[PDB]
Design a protein around this ligand. Sequence first.
Ligand SMILES: O=P(O)(O)OC[C@H]1O[C@@H](O)[C@H](O)[C@@H](O)[C@@H]1O
Ligand SMILES: O=P(O)(O)OC[C@H]1O[C@@H](O)[C@H](O)[C@@H](O)[C@@H]1O
Lengths: 474, 474
Amino acid sequence: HLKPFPPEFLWGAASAAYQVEGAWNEDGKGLSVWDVFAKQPGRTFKGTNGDVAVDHYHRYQEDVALMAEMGLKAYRFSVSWSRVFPDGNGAVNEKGLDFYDRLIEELRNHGIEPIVTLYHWDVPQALMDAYGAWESRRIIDDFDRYAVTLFQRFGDRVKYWVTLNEQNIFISFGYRLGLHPPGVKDMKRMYEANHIANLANAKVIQSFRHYVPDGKIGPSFAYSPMYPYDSRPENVLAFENAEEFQNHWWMDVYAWGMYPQAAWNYLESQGLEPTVAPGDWELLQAAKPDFMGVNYYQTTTVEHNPPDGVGEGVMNTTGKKGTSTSSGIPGLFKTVRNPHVDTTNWDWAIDPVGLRIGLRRIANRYQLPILITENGLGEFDTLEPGDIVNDDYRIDYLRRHVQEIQRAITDGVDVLGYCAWSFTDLLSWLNGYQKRYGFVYVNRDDESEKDLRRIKKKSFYWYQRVIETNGAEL
Amino acid sequence: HLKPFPPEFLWGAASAAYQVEGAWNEDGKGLSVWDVFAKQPGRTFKGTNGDVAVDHYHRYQEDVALMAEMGLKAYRFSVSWSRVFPDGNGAVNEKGLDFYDRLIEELRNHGIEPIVTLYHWDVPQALMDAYGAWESRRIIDDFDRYAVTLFQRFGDRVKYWVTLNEQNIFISFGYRLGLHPPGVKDMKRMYEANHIANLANAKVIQSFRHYVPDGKIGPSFAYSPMYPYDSRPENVLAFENAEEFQNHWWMDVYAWGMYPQAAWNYLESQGLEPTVAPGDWELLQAAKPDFMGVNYYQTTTVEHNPPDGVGEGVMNTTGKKGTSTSSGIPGLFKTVRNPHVDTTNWDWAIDPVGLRIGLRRIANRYQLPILITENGLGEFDTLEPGDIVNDDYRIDYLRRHVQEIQRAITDGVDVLGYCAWSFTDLLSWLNGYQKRYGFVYVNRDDESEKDLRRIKKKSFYWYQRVIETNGAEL
Ligand SMILES: O=P(O)(O)OC[C@H]1O[C@@H](O)[C@H](O)[C@@H](O)[C@@H]1O
Ligand SMILES: O=P(O)(O)OC[C@H]1O[C@@H](O)[C@H](O)[C@@H](O)[C@@H]1O
């Protein structure tokens, strides 16, 4: 017998500024590292970039109206740092703030709760130029100044805040895999910047307590819960290493202010552990969040990986199902296909039970409320005659995940809300437009920009009915 | 490249008073619940009881000389509460204290560190008679009076103390399975007695901080780390349930003073959650131990268990392999044979890597030092002519477990010592005498005490060499 979703459950949907806004150089916006990076040839699919994206900066009023039509309880978006401080640390750009003000007012005028993400991977290029951005402790006070600017301006209207979105992704992709700005493949630098981002997170949560005392704040972690392949003890040990190295490495810092000891010792034995200054641990331990943000898409099954074995594997860029290969850390673990779940054509696991598991793991380990900040299915959508997009695949994925959330809530996990990814179709960081996540289809592809018109998918009306029946009808 | 065992590592061996001492009615000792229980017909194998056991009460000087020959760094034993307080809470039996004094003096005169266990399952019968022993809050102050009696008498000479030995066993065998005193099969009463024992534990740790400010104290948990059968999401979820319900339920209280939420809510949904009084959480949270004691023998693998599925299973007390059957909690999990490890004739899994996994889990979750208070192999031994016992099976088991301990130390786990179960052969609570654990064979069986003579097994000389080389030679 399931509990119902609490009466004030934030039924949400989410975006990211670079992925949706466009207007990349209007009203005084400075350059972000993604403005620069995406124009480098060969980085992104068929050269797609966020110059225009889906032009939400100009079309937000149409977008919020569709949200109100849908009946969204909440909308999560990120603020573009380079719209607010074109220099990163220089003078405030009033026009930048004014856009987010207009957006927030528009949201509230329709009874939609704003959830403001501070950082979704678009640090101003100037800070990378001036001092290497996340590799310098200077970004801690510059990021604080930016966050306090937003707290003072919108705190009276915004209850829910997310600090760093998927810090493990932009640190890892940006400094170990070289797929994100700054395009580095250096684990020593990766863990130095990661440590500085941890301090940045902690500093702004401390500021938030001062400036928005009645608000709620937390980081948002890209969580792939780990599985052992089987009950072979070496495979279970590989799972212990994988969950600690991939997940606790970040979530323990967010929740407890300390790195896990085994992973630290392994990094130390390699000279990879970050530099620590007096006052780091106290700051990290003094910044307890109100919730853990969770971006969830899939789980990961691992097995034993000998000292000889797998390192970086092949990511699935194409959509040809089966093209991924195992990634691992030699001596600790390597990934392996989970034979008991389906995958998308990008080899992403479809594992809605895995979300319940991950929600139970966070509650069991940290006793924190959880805000699900991202969950969605990316697939090709066909526009059929009569403005009909039948994305039954997307409905099927979202339904099973929402069902497992309800089971998690019945187990006792405190889930604050759920933000589907995404509200409209948007630009993928590297893969363009054809892998769509939206409830609302946007009329463009990789070649033709067309008119960017919004078209309600079938999933839009499915989810309209979910919010209407507070989840009782799925 | 492995870290060495630290220089003051406690290379130990262990026993329990009812299993070893005998002298059940000598020198003013009162009846314990096990004196009474084991003499009820059908409770124990061939009617074996602890009237004589292996008569360590009279033979402790010989046994300590053998420990010294082996070069034992530490000896862990339990104190028999009914020797000290014959009626549990009245006047002290000075002859009872005087035995443990002579024992501790004998250990110290041979340079062996005593590790005193306060409680190994033998509460005096008079407290069971007066108020039902662990089922009444009366036991909190009675157990405290007894603990403080020991702290004041021996605290000058005993640094390391264990409070409750395997609370999860004597509570669940005593109140859920009905296999131990008081022979109850009632889940509601089980969780009430369990909660009272948590309070008694915390209360004596509080007293210890006053009376033995330089000592180290912890409870000892019977730890079987859980494994999922495979990467099927329903089986990983059964693993999350199993590890929380069987393991976190006790260790979270010990380390954090808190029950885990999902397990609590499932018990509450069944009317089984314990009665909580004002001040309970305050006491439980304010009694941090210096270390987590760990009794480890095996891991347990689990799979999905439907709501109509498995409950109590068949236990193996005969010694014929393949007799055990699945046990579980309907709707949460059930056990299943791990196909990737061997088992003993009593169906206990042989999983030395599981010990590394369990030590890693404790350090990862609680960041506590660990004292391994029990680990060993129970098997039939053959006394061959010339008083020779070749127990290579025991050496093989201890060697691989000690090997995995070193890997855990190298990972960063703070292991304070290792107490092999057991120093001499002793009485098994239910299984009689033939399932032997000792380094030292004792010449007796289930039908005759014979001459109770002590005979060093082959594993005696193996462990002697382990200690002489501080574990460099295994
Ligand atoms: O590469 P894909 O399939 O388009 O997935 C990208 C999505 O994956 C998530 O990791 C990001 O938080 C989103 O910003 C992004 O939209
Ligand atoms: O294998 P057996 O004979 O059932 O014994 C298990 C042993 O290990 C633990 O369960 C107990 O702490 C010991 O007291 C007991 O001797």
